[PDB]
Design a protein around this ligand. Structure first.
Ligand SMILES: OC[C@H]1O[C@@H](O[C@H]2[C@H](O)[C@@H](O)[C@H](O)O[C@@H]2CO)[C@H](O)[C@@H](O)[C@H]1O
Ligand SMILES: OC[C@H]1O[C@@H](O[C@H]2[C@H](O)[C@@H](O)[C@H](O)O[C@@H]2CO)[C@H](O)[C@@H](O)[C@H]1O
Ligand SMILES: [Ca+2]
Ligand SMILES: [Ca+2]
Ligand SMILES: [Mn+2]
Ligand SMILES: [Mn+2]
Lengths: 239, 239
């Protein structure tokens, strides 16, 4: 079995294993701030940032046809401090082509280029979306499973517990092709679950980069924080 | 759509909507004790008890072929107070033939008759198993998805947080045939997830009873509590 595994119980400036893109940065206190936090401690609009683990992950073997199973967990918080306008845009875990650069911001969350499905994206993503765009369900926030498109194949509304830490667990089982996602807020005890069938050998390239991305909005104060406190990942490809 | 829904935020002696079988009883404090708690407050061995909701649930239409999706949530605690012998046997959520009576106890958890697969059981169950029997994986406790057999098609180990309350969420989506299960311990923050493909039209009868069952062991003090604090359920069958 070809395996890869990492675990950041907190982040540290200078860590060898993370690529930082766009606005993303790691604080001395150990927090990955995906989108810009201004001097006043307030989140900035028009910001997009991502992090990628530095080593690619082998998701399927082009010779034998084996396919990997994987699990990722992370803790994040989103604080929406402005009474108006509406907050935006969200954060997302994503897997796709290696040597990956940020895509479009705002509702595309730094991962996609427009709102059409395009199998060439070869990207699978799990979003926590805070702004209802023309292609979105009305309930925000919502968890979304995105396969080669920002228009989720399936969503599940969740109530934001403003500024509180959410724990996320995402598992993909190759034999069953089931991607299952869980969101828990220790603060309120709320638990959300969503699952869908995903054929990763069809969707993803055989090797991928894995990362997290966040975006704030297209007008003044359509913003919120996208802070991440820990992140772990494990994948196993049968041989 | 033909729907059925119930929610017990706590239990109350005399409630119209619950059938109590075997050792199960509801306390004045609002707790469903599935297995017997002795005068001294200690759990009794050789005990089996179940509860069933009083109305049957329509899981699939024998005429049109539609199939129901459903969700159930409940909170329970298991306290293993004896240093020896090993604790046993576990508790379980189950769906199967109506007019259902308790089956065999101990490792069969009040739901099955022996350890062989038998499609005639027409039963789907999600177990939280505390004793490793001859047909079980070694890690206990474990979550198990049981389809017509006490020998789970898939299991996931979990650490007991002794005497603490666990929150369970189980969802079945007919279109994808995915049964997904989540266990969370607010006390420790632990989160467990397990999912598998289940064809309910093949497994279950068109109408079922839904219930919870618990069992303690076959020798003195191979026992633990199986207390339930709340339970909700919702099913929708397309028309
Ligand atoms: O309000 C945040 C929201 O903005 C959308 O873009 C708007 C923009 O804010 C508005 O000033 C302009 O007139 O229209 C744009 C839409 O065409 C983003 O698309 C959305 O994702 C959020 O960021
Ligand atoms: O120890 C609890 C455990 O007991 C198993 O049954 C045992 C029994 O405890 C022992 O005294 C007897 O000699 O052998 C039995 C097994 O053949 C139950 O099967 C198991 O589910 C637990 O309840
Ligand atoms: Ca959106
Ligand atoms: Ca067992
Ligand atoms: Mn969305
Ligand atoms: Mn078992």
């Amino acid at each position: 079995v070809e395996t890869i595994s990492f675990s950041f119980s907190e982040f540290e400036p200078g860590n060898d294993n993370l690529t930082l893109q766009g606005a993303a940065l790691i604080t001395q206190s150990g927090v990955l701030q995906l989108t810009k936090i201004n001097q006043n401690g307030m989140p900035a609009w028009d910001s997009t940032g991502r992090t990628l683990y530095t080593k690619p992950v082998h998701m399927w073997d082009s010779t034998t046809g084996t396919v990997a199973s994987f699990e990722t967990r992370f803790s994040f918080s989103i604080e929406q401090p402005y009474t108006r306008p509406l907050p935006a845009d969200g954060l997302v875990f994503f897997m796709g082509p290696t040597k990956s650069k940020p895509a479009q911001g705002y509702g595309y969350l730094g991962v996609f280029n427009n709102s059409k499905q395009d199998n060439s994206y070869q990207t699978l993503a799990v979003e926590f979306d805070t702004f209802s765009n023309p292609w979105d369900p009305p309930q925000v926030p919502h968890i979304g499973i995105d396969v080669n498109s920002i228009r989720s194949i399936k969503t599940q509304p969740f109530q934001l517990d403003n500024g509180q830490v959410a724990n996320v667990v995402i598992k993909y089982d190759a034999p069953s092709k089931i991607l299952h996602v869980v969101l828990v807020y220790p603060s309120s005890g709320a638990i959300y679950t969503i699952a869908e069938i995903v054929d990763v050998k069809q969707v993803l390239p055989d090797w991928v980069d894995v990362g997290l991305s966040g975006a704030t909005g297209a007008q003044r104060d359509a913003a919120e924080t996208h802070d991440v406190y820990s992140w772990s990942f494990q994948a196993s490809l049968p041989e």
